[PDB]
Amino acid sequence: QGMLLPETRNLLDLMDAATRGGRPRLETLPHAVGRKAVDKMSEDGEADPPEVAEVANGGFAGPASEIRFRRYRPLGEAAGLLPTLIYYHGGGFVIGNIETHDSTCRRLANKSRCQVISIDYRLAPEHPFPAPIDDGIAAFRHIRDNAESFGADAARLAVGGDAAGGAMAAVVCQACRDAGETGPAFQMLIYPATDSSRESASRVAFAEGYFLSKALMDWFWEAYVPEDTDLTDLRLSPLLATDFTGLPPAFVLTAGYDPLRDEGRAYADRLIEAGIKTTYVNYPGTIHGFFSLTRFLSQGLKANDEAAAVMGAHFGT
Amino acid sequence: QGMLLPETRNLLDLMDAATRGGRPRLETLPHAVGRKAVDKMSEDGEADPPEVAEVANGGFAGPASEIRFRRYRPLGEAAGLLPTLIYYHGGGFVIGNIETHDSTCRRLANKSRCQVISIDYRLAPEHPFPAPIDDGIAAFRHIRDNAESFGADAARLAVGGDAAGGAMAAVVCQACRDAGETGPAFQMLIYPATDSSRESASRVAFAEGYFLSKALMDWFWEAYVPEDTDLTDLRLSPLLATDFTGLPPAFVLTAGYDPLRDEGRAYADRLIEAGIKTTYVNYPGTIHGFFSLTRFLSQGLKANDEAAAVMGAHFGT
Ligand SMILES: [Cl-]
């Protein structure tokens, strides 16, 4: 509690005041009902959307449905084929969408001078595991196969995301390597979930009072994962991978008071020791979700900028 | 090993071609004589110097001599007071100077949109320990207390350096912290030496054949460190510090085949554990000194950009 930043404590205080005021916790609601309510809050939680050069909306055929996408063209960039980040929003594979991370994607685009393409994958409980990560993989594969159609440089096609979306990005890289196909050139992991098989110290220590609670994580899990599923499944627990060689250069960010902190850092450790170019950063005194809670948390904007800057430097923009 | 990048292999081959070609190795020359020869090579080893807005040369009164400096004003900024990186060149406190790292500082300035001030501290064997670091500390203190005359924003004053210069930057932060003084807002540690008391696994594994050899390190040591100096001295071994709290946000970079790799990463680890905002990156398959050997190693240019981008994003430029 002592290492908590004033802006972080302030937001938590506001949240606590709201709950005691009468605002129902998300885990007490039906998933579809709760989703609609919290997604609007997530939208309002972002900073004002910065202007970009161009925003495109469309969809393509996924494995079992249409997958909607949104492309963001960075200001000042005139090239036809841009280095491109495929972005997967967070929300426990249950909530969130393109709109909940729209401002964040906009800023990432401008700051990195890379195109950003946000993906609207299928959500649980309507489409449980492995449907969401299947869409994520299909989305990368489709955009890769049709890079020029998406205004993308196929040699510099990155994947990334926050939390659950960070997990998805991480799994996409592993899935491609294991399949023996060309994978992403870069992975941007923003406090990703990497281990569903065991509880780290941060998972236990930050179970309550830090926005992302254990009760909420259980609420997510009950919709995402069917009864009796192997928790060591690499699509659920990419951290447990036996081989980390052959994975793309990485940016891995954690938050100091995030339950997912330790397993994020451990994922970075595996990449480093495998000889993969890896950039790891921890933002102390902030919480899970700060990357897109940028109406309340300045640290999130700083994290946006560093992540974009590192990717931008990697791709030489 | 097999993880060596092709550009890294080519440079190492050029060096051993020159050695058996007749070129005497640095550790077989008197320090003064060897310095003149290697500095020219260090200058030539840099990429072509990019244009900047303005270059200033001057000096101020140090503890025991005049300390020369070079200010680099970044292109496109043109504000009165800029976020500033105080930079200390590398060379084992024996060789190197402002000229050997000129092109690098220029790129750092432009990419980060921060002013860079390169410090020409006293060198061994003419001025052994603790003279070189004493100048480094005095350089920061003087600029900090005279920020406006150095065109610097006092609230955004960083220190940084490569190798020996990286060590200096780290020590400056500890010194100010321990003295209760206002220290740097940021530290950029490019493969720093952090532990002179023990030989890490990387120090043993990469002791020979990777540009920075054990023979060269011992050659630096005899000029720099006087007889029976306590090797656990924190000015020689900042990694051994018992307290890491109160230190500024950091960028720590290591190279995959650097003897100093392990202790560099350990220092970042200590910072992370202590709750300091810390960005760590390892560049696998490249060597010690690649950050400024940018005529031969393009990885160095990427390293320049990442370091600059991280500092820029931290300072909000
Ligand atoms: Cl339900």
Side-chain angles (χ1 to χ4, degrees):
Chain A
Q1 294 296 96
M3 300 162 56
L4 215 51
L5 293 171
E7 72 170 27
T8 311
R9 174 176 304 274
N10 175 245
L11 177 56
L12 292 174
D13 288 338
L14 293 174
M15 289 178 174
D16 188 43
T19 299
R20 278 145 45 198
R23 185 159 80 191
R25 307 148 153 123
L26 183 57
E27 61 266 26
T28 58
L29 306 175
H31 293 92
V33 171
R35 173 190 291 120
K36 185 186 179 184
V38 67
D39 282 347
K40 312 186 133 253
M41 293 185 55
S42 297
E43 292 187 53
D44 301 339
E46 281 195 306
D48 290 330
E51 288 292 339
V52 301
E54 184 193 87
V55 177
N57 290 283
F60 60 89
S65 66
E66 180 188 55
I67 303 182
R68 300 287 301 179
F69 63 90
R70 179 170 298 171
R71 302 193 294 129
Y72 306 86
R73 188 174 182 86
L75 288 174
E77 302 301 311
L81 304 173
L82 294 173
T84 295
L85 169 67
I86 300 172
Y87 193 89
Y88 309 107
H89 70 82
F93 310 100
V94 174
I95 63 175
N97 52 50
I98 292 180
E99 312 292 350
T100 63
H101 291 60
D102 183 82
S103 296
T104 298
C105 287
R106 284 171 174 265
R107 187 178 182 98
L108 287 179
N110 288 334
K111 294 296 183 177
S112 69
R113 293 167 300 275
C114 295
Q115 175 180 218
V116 175
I117 303 183
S118 185
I119 300 302
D120 201 16
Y121 54 89
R122 279 176 296 161
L123 298 168
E126 298 85 358
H127 309 288
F129 178 89
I133 47 104
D134 281 350
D135 285 353
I137 295 173
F140 168 77
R141 283 172 175 167
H142 180 79
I143 292 178
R144 175 199 65 197
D145 299 347
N146 303 269
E148 312 192 332
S149 187
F150 286 85
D153 178 15
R156 293 177 294 173
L157 188 59
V159 295
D162 62 290
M168 189 171 298
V171 172
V172 166
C173 294
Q174 287 194 17
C176 289
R177 181 209 59 192
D178 294 340
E181 68 188 286
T182 291
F186 186 89
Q187 50 182 323
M188 180 189 295
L189 311 182
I190 304 304
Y191 36 78
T194 68
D195 192 7
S196 309
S197 74
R198 62 209 209 272
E199 300 226 81
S200 67
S202 64
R203 278 233 181 189
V204 186
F206 307 137
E208 284 187 24
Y210 304 102
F211 186 52
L212 179 63
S213 74
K214 170 64 175 178
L216 178 53
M217 279 180 269
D218 290 340
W219 184 82
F220 284 147
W221 190 259
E222 85 177 25
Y224 182 46
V225 181
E227 194 269 3
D228 266 333
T229 304
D230 195 339
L231 299 187
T232 63
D233 190 282
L234 297 187
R235 298 168 296 181
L236 293 172
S237 309
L239 177 58
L240 302 185
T242 293
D243 182 23
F244 273 76
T245 69
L247 300 179
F251 175 86
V252 181
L253 183 151
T254 58
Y257 284 84
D258 191 347
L260 302 181
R261 182 194 70 189
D262 289 353
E263 65 195 69
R265 183 182 185 194
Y267 200 84
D269 288 340
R270 291 298 308 271
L271 283 165
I272 295 173
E273 282 137 37
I276 310 302
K277 175 180 293 181
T278 308
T279 297
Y280 171 79
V281 58
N282 180 248
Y283 276 63
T286 195
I287 53 174
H288 183 87
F290 80 106
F291 198 81
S292 58
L293 284 168
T294 45
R295 183 171 300 270
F296 302 100
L297 308 178
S298 292
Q299 292 293 305
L301 292 170
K302 287 176 174 157
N304 294 164
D305 295 348
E306 183 179 2
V310 167
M311 180 176 66
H314 184 73
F315 282 150
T317 65
Chain B
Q1 235 78 49
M3 288 192 53
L4 280 175
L5 297 179
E7 69 166 23
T8 307
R9 311 181 71 98
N10 297 343
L11 176 58
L12 290 176
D13 292 341
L14 286 183
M15 293 192 183
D16 296 329
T19 293
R20 275 148 18 188
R23 180 182 294 176
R25 283 171 164 122
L26 181 55
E27 57 267 31
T28 58
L29 306 166
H31 303 93
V33 169
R35 173 186 293 122
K36 317 227 194 66
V38 64
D39 281 345
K40 188 53 191 133
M41 295 181 182
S42 296
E43 290 188 49
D44 296 342
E46 276 197 311
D48 288 337
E51 285 302 286
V52 295
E54 178 188 272
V55 181
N57 290 280
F60 57 89
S65 71
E66 176 196 19
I67 302 181
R68 293 182 183 174
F69 62 90
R70 182 167 298 174
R71 303 166 58 221
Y72 303 88
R73 185 175 196 81
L75 287 173
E77 286 314 299
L81 311 179
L82 296 175
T84 300
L85 168 65
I86 302 181
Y87 193 90
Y88 311 106
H89 71 82
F93 308 97
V94 177
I95 64 176
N97 51 68
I98 288 182
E99 305 290 353
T100 60
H101 291 63
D102 182 77
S103 295
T104 301
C105 287
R106 287 171 176 263
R107 189 177 182 97
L108 290 182
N110 285 340
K111 294 289 181 177
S112 67
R113 296 167 298 278
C114 301
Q115 173 182 225
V116 175
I117 303 179
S118 183
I119 303 304
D120 194 29
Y121 54 92
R122 284 171 297 158
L123 299 170
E126 298 85 4
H127 308 299
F129 180 87
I133 285 184
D134 284 332
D135 289 347
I137 298 177
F140 169 77
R141 288 179 177 170
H142 179 77
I143 293 177
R144 174 201 65 191
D145 300 339
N146 299 267
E148 328 84 45
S149 69
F150 285 89
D153 178 15
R156 291 180 295 173
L157 245 190
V159 297
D162 60 290
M168 187 173 299
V171 171
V172 167
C173 295
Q174 291 196 16
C176 294
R177 195 272 317 269
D178 294 338
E181 273 192 343
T182 295
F186 189 87
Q187 51 178 319
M188 178 191 299
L189 307 185
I190 306 301
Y191 39 73
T194 63
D195 200 343
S196 302
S197 65
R198 40 182 183 177
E199 317 191 26
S200 66
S202 65
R203 264 181 180 261
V204 180
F206 309 137
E208 207 178 334
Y210 302 101
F211 191 38
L212 182 65
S213 66
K214 172 63 159 52
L216 182 61
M217 301 192 68
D218 295 345
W219 183 79
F220 284 145
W221 190 260
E222 290 316 319
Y224 179 50
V225 178
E227 248 200 59
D228 185 64
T229 301
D230 183 23
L231 260 49
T232 61
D233 190 286
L234 297 185
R235 295 167 301 177
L236 292 175
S237 308
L239 177 63
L240 301 185
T242 68
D243 179 28
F244 272 76
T245 68
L247 299 181
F251 175 85
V252 185
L253 182 149
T254 63
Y257 287 87
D258 195 341
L260 310 180
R261 184 193 69 187
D262 288 13
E263 71 198 62
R265 182 186 179 190
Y267 198 84
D269 282 339
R270 291 302 306 267
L271 290 170
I272 293 169
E273 301 290 343
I276 309 297
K277 182 182 290 180
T278 303
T279 302
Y280 170 82
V281 56
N282 180 248
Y283 276 65
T286 192
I287 55 171
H288 183 89
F290 85 105
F291 192 83
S292 60
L293 276 165
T294 46
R295 179 171 305 273
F296 304 101
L297 305 186
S298 61
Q299 287 295 298
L301 292 175
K302 289 168 150 291
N304 295 158
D305 294 350
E306 172 164 15
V310 168
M311 184 180 63
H314 182 84
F315 280 150
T317 70

